[PDB]
RNA sequence: UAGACGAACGGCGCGUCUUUAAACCAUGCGUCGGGAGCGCGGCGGGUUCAGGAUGAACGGCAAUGCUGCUCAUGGCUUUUUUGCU
DNA sequence: TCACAATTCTAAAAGCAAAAAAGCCTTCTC
DNA sequence: GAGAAGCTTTTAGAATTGTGA
């Protein structure tokens, strides 16, 4: 159903997932045998004997499940619940051991190595190097791509500084921060930088003219000077300072 | 979550760095389909005029 | 009314419930935070407070804390951890009398844990509750080491 | 079609003059109505200009002399019509 | 349209000239209808109309009325955008002091008057009085009175006594003072200062006064009388959901100040008493000071809940001021985000763009094409057609995308490869498909990262994306030469599995006709992918100039190597495919392909390599199972052995035969040794595990274990990880850093138990906290480098210079850390390279040392080169293309225009996220011996003993290229002589570490000169040995009477006639310090080498401190002049020390502390750059004394040490240019025939060009001493204030510029970025040069 | 049901009254609308002077109008949590 | 006088994005 | 009700004063 990469195991030393894969394969093998019995309709004697064999293997383990007390009617109910794979509890720091995993694999008819032979889906060719297949518990985290995608051509703009709003919630543009500005300066990209600073953020007449030019098959911008800079000039003149743009 | 069947191998670069290659049988069975409930409020106010 | 509503509605420690999973809710309720009104802050936090002290053992989880800025300050409370009448975390141990390991549960706090030698949970026990092998790994003064039976 | 501009760069050895020269030629094609000097292969004006530079028949000198010439012929048309 | 920005102080008349009307009432709006109200903060009469082309009352609305001022209400019908540009003013009833010019530290009103700050502060806030115009009384003007003294003076002195209070008095003082006469008088008095501390104060004050009279300012303009008000539309009262209003905070502050002003006007009108008006003037002062900068006075006034409300300085300052928030970075249109996935089918100039995002970003282009085709006449029809997503819109969208690039960007853009241009391919989905190869450049994995995409609109931006930023141009890094398109992890695993050999595989030992038959054999199944085979392979050498010759032959290869040979282009050999091809091998493959063939073959080759690697990694089926972590079979034996030895040491301690620390060290060492043994056993088992047979007995080969191939290919992991998986994970340190005694003997294949896991958690939490809290430190450092270096650009082809740095291989003392071949690759030679034979030009003196020339140098084995360096370039306002050298990201010389300061800062800063945040000379090899700076004599043993504190040695090969260097202190037992040959492992020298010998060049008897038995010495017999000796003492314990009697000793002959110092005719008086235990008493004929008197004894912040140029806390004091040194007077505060030159004079004297084991005695010489006390050194001293080349080489070496210990590789051009931008000022010593002051600190290029043009005639130039500033000071103390104010210290920078009347011609990158025009760096270089050509 | 008034005019709205201009509000209620330049005059608003709270003149602007010449026809702050480096 | 040195005041502390909630002076009426 | 009147970071640099000779 799903294919992962082996390269994530060595560097990111999480060996727990391979062990979980092996033990899940073993559990699903037990469930597959129970399904085979429960399909080719059998009698409760063989089912209870096999489930007892499954519940009574390992080292000296806490729980003792004896099916002689189950009254033969809920043994079939138990088998129906176990036809999807026998659940297994592996407490945190006193869990199972690879010898127990191999014994549970050998209870089913699975290979103790944990690795089987696979075939290519579109060339019918055997892969070499037996691969590790098994059952792993996958979660679906709440980071959905249809909540992250967002795009904008034009929209509304802030009041004080005539720039695009920011956010997917209020339809808005992307921040072209100062590190991106540096990275554009490190190329020779002076025109890209000028257009992103004037005609796509601030210069109001420039950006209206740019729109009208684009729709008219003409790709050319009128430079203009940003409105944020005028806001800064007024914010500085509101002190005692007198900052002025000199003549041509 | 759901207990899926897994194989640890590369596959034509589609699980290259941390990507995952799912099969169509996972989507046909709706094994990872979720229900989300939004809420939308329309508030009628006492505006001028 | 204004004061109690300010506490419950708009406070740093009275936060919107995390609810998309039973585990998310339950682990949001058992969450300890070193921030808040009367505590330290994310940027003012050093590294000695961002860290796993040896007395966290059995009272605070070492491996459940959010990554990013507030690592180490949003700790989570262990399964058997509890609280004194005075507000200090305590955790349960089994009294080990005369070599035999009985089953009366004493709830020890960090300032009492240092005056005893606490054996380890997975140290083998035989029938009737002796230590099968004649010397065991323990921790006595904030430090692990191997002691006589 | 264009993937790499190294051949275009080799005949204008600055890589910042290439951008301006190709911008001039592409703007001529797009707005000025000039006819491309190479066959169109469903390329855009920028790629057509870069292909022309690769072939070796556009540069700063050629553009300047062509501009001078066409201005001179338009002025000559004015002169003939008026005198 | 404009060329500069002029900043100055605003006159009250100037403020009235900006104004459009004077605000009178605090109120803003009505709340019945939300229109403005007269003379309020929002007033249509003052600040312009509310609606476009309409009058407020409603009288004037026609097109014939644009301009008329209505009489009913006074508004001027016009555009409402005019609200965004009109200022008012407020007429303060009493003058008020501007907070900035008063409390900026330095105070521009304080030092101007010479009054101290706190007195002015008391005077202004109405807490004391101040007199002016003392008259014919004994009271001076600027002194401060107080209430009781004011009363006393007034009762005892009549009307002719002006004593005022508040800002009015400060204004009267400031206005009464004449500037020219004070400047002249104080300059005259400055010449007689005698160089005390006060001199510094004066040269500040004068610098104000002259700078304050050259410009057109007057003092009283620092005191506010009229106050401007911000236009209403910059502090808007936006309505919200309900009847209330979302007001700004500026409105609140203005309301407050207007309230207080109105109250004060009322009280002054109604003849109020003095106390109440005094209080109200104080309160209005506080209100204005809150308005301009809320928080500089006492605790900031809080607006509504708990937050101090923002003032104007807050809206200009900070990380959320206008500069850093809205001018240096913006939000942009035509941009989107989404999650990134992997597309392995793309060519590396492509990306996958969702159809939805493509349609959302390219709407205007689609409208253009729709109206062009006629499919929709009006714009609204096209808009609605696009909104319904018709079937024709998609062919249009596929036509407005063909060759239109888009910029892809990941969140932290650490270097310039975090933005790249791609040609979109439309994709059905919601995630952006990114090529696998470009992921390394972005540092992007596919576990949830997002990416932002931008669209270039204009035609020149499309050309720039296609030419400068396209991903097929950025294959090499700019930080070094190495590629950045090396295959990452699955490709390398596939190529390592494919190009390999098994000692007996299917279809071994058959002969093939070429790669094609190998591939057919493999695919059909008749042979294994890695079986040894003979193949006929034709390879093309392009040795002939522009000509390829096709050699053919039979080669012993594998089937997989033969299959891979098909991809490889023509010019390459077969030696590159005939090995195992790990990761480094593939990197070298791509590098040689690029350097030999070109670009297009390299790009096609990289794509083909990715495809084939992915394909054969799929075919291999390489997995990872539990049985691929093989524990050593001998692990438990080793662990039992080590544990038994540990128990033995514990028993040894229990019996009290050892202490604690040595038990700790024995335990830690034995556990470390056991860990290394287990690791070696594990790796030896793993790597060679497989054993297999060909035709009989079993041979053995390299292991096909999956984890071994993963950690050996270089695909993923390293030996440490395989150690932790299979062998024990060793020893863990607790938070204090003390290594825990008990190791973790369990590995991850087995289980850790609870205690071991707890210790592992200590370590893991420490690491995660370290990274999460060092990201910000790296970001700050990178910001500071960029803001110091950003304005440096390549602007010339040649400075016409011969000076340059001497680059040699760098050796810490062991093996060479990195050769000469790597240092001078792509640098321009400054002075020619001579053939090692004799004085023959080997390569010219302006070559670009590319691979050919460097290999030539290597084969001829040149010791070192002199190369042109950036720091030694005489180009002013930039650098020249030759001193900088090669463009690293490209292959050619650097282009005129390229901005190298930004790229240098990015190269230094990007690897900052990998750094951390929290005997005898045993020779190695056999070669000749050389020494330099050695002063030594022969001893009785026939060895050689050294009398210098800066002695060293080299072991050198048979070719003269040095291999090993060492350092020998004063007085070492040399085991060989200079010029001889030694044997590998032969010890060459040995010393006595803790004792400092006083060895003599002469020999004989001793004289007891000037010792008092009890003060100079205190007898302390060596009790446990039997014999006794004198014990000299220092000056810190003896009585004052004998303190001046310095305890010394002298060597003489038998007759007592003094044996003179060799080389001169003076006795050799060896003065000694305390603890100079003289074991050998008189009567012993000494020998040379005899100890006369025993004298017993970071990470990233390191880089930040090196660039900050922080002086250490224990600097190694240096020497300033040659000649005999001497001690000084008996410790008045500090032990005085004098130097005496031969040619020069000897006034020089230094105040050294008493806590240093000095390196020099009285009878010894020194030199510029010598050490007087060892320890960490200060770069300022290196610049001042040793030179500029010394400091740049020092900083380069000490930064590259940090960056090389972590395995990072940066070129040395970048640190050189940051150094150049640091040492950029200079203080003038001799004014000369120029107009620079005594000690004014001036831009070094300024004085350079000044005296350069001044020496056109025969006049004299000037003399200067260069200063070394940090990166905060080197960037704040610049000549342009727009740059500095946008970086840090906005208030200080703006006050300095305003009082100085400064003028900013833009000339830089950040300045042109703020004002929204073309930067003068890349494609905008031509336009700026054009502008400069029209002036 | 209709008429009138509410800083110039018209429609519409709202408030008040009934042949009358009042009352309400007080940058004298709300929203929308006037093809433009020159010319004529001038509601409204102000300047000067006096007279002794009153009155004469005035033209930079200018409302309902009149004759003639020229022209195309749209959100910010604080807090919290999360995600990727 | 005129020089070190302890105090203390001032500045700075990465980037990008998603969701949610709480708010937008006191007070004085009669 | 609606409308106003008025109690903990850490580092580092630069400016005082507080003895100290
Ligand atoms: Mg990631
Ligand atoms: Zn009006
Ligand atoms: Zn140069």
Residue numbers in the entry:
A (entry chain I): 1095 to 1342
B (entry chain I): 797 to 845
C (entry chain I): 499 to 647
D (entry chain K): 2 to 84
E (entry chain J): 16 to 933, 948 to 1126, 1136 to 1373
Paste lines from the article:
Lambdoid phage HK022 contains a cis-element, put, which suppresses pausing and termination during transcription of the early phage genes. The putRNA transcript solely performs the anti-pausing/termination activities by interacting directly with the E.coli RNAP elongation complex (EC) by an unknown structural mechanism. In this study, we synthesized the putL RNA using the Eco RNAP σ70-holoenzyme initiated from the native HK022 PL promoter, and captured the modified ECs using a transcription roadblock for cryo-EM analysis. Cryo-EM analysis of the putEC prepared by promoter-dependent transcription initiation, transcription elongation, and LacI roadblocking revealed three EC populations at sub-4 Å resolution: (1) the putEC (3.2 Å-resolution, 36.9% of the EC particles) that contains well-folded putRNA, (2) the put-less EC (3.6 Å, 22.4%) that does not display any well-defined putRNA density and (3) the σ70-bound putEC (3.6 Å, 40.7%) that contains both σ70 and putRNA.
In the cryo-EM structure of the putEC, the putRNA was located at the opening of the RNA exit channel of the EC adjacent to the β’ZBD. This location is consistent with the put-inactivating RNAP mutations and potentially would restrict the RNA hairpin formation in the adjoining RNA exit channel via electrostatic repulsion. The modeled putRNA from U2* to U74* contains twenty-one Watson-Crick (WC) base pairs and five non-canonical base pairs, A9*-G35* (Saenger class VIII), G12*-U32* (Saenger class XXVIII), G43*-A64* (Saenger class XI), G42*-U65* and C44*-A63*. In the putEC structure, the ‘V’-shaped putRNA binds to the prominent β’ZBD by its pothole formed in the center of the ‘V’. The β’ZBD fits snuggly to the putRNA surface, generating a 1130.3 Å2 interface area formed by ~33% of the total putRNA residues. At the backside of the putRNA-β’ZBD interface, the N-terminal loop of the β flap-tip helix makes significant contact with the putRNA with an interface area of 281.6 Å2. At the bifurcation point of the two stem structures, β’R77 locates like a wedge to separate G35* and G36* and forms a cation-π interaction with G35*. The alignment of the EC structures according to the core module revealed that the putEC structure is most similar to the non-paused, active EC conformation, having the lowest RMSD values between Cɑ-carbons of domains as well as the smallest swiveling angle of 1.2°. In the putEC, the active site region of the RNA-DNA hybrid exhibited a post-translocated state similar to the non-paused EC at the high threshold value of the map. Instead, the phosphate backbone of the putRNA is located near the RNA exit channel, prohibiting the RNA hairpin formation with its negative-charged surface.
